[PDB]
Amino acid sequence: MRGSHHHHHHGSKTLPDKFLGTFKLERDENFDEYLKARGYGWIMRQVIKLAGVTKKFRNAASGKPDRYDMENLTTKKDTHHKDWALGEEFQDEALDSTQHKITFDLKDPNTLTETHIKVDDPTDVETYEYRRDGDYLVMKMSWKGVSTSRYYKKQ
Numbered sequence: 001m002r003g004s005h006h007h008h009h010h011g012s013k014t015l016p017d018k019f020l021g022t023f024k025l026e027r028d029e030n031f032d033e034y035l036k037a038r039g040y041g042w043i044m045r046q047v048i049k050l051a052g053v054t055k056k057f058r059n060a061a062s063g064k065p066d067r068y069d070m071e072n073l074t075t076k077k078d079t080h081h082k083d084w085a086l087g088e089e090f091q092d093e094a095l096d097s098t099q100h101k102i103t104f105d106l107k108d109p110n111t112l113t114e115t116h117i118k119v120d121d122p123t124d125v126e127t128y129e130y131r132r133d134g135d136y137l138v139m140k141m142s143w144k145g146v147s148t149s150r151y152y153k154k155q
């Protein structure tokens with residue numbers, strides 16, 4: 001995705017309120033397989049799978065328009081994307097604990113993408129997808145064909 005040349009139409013898209021608010025993880029599916037595919041061993045899988053997750057999306061207190069804040073509170077981790085826009089690429093610390101290049105993008109009007117690109121190894125990327133389904137935020141994570149769907153409800 002790259003539309004730098006003439007981005008007046010895609011200047012800044014404002015997050016649909018469907019993705020906004022605080023969501024607590026209800027359940028997930030095929031998460032272990034995703035972890036294996038992602039290259040996480042048993043130890044990591046013992047962490048990652050047992051990590052409860054709370055999503056927080058809000059208008060960015062940065063004081064600007066269109067921007068949004070998003071943090072990923074878990075049991076063992078914690079990440080806080082201060083002031084980001086969809087289609088925007090910024091540096092920050094992801095769940096993987098490093099401070100690397102990250103990009104968000106509204107790919108469809110019901111699915112946002114979170115892509116983590118490590119400064120050290122940009123090939124060991126990782127992508128989450130924020131889909132809406134019903135009154136739940138449904139995350140889709142796919143690696144090596146392995147899709148895992150994490151079902152988040154509001155708080």
Ligand SMILES: CCCCCCCC/C=C\CCCCCCCC(=O)O
Nearest residue numbers: 047048051053072074077095096139
């Ligand atoms: C599943 C990818 C985990 C990447 C970081 C692994 C090291 C830290 C341990 C556990 C991570 C907890 C978060 C798991 C992914 C949450 C995805 C999400 O819903 O945003």
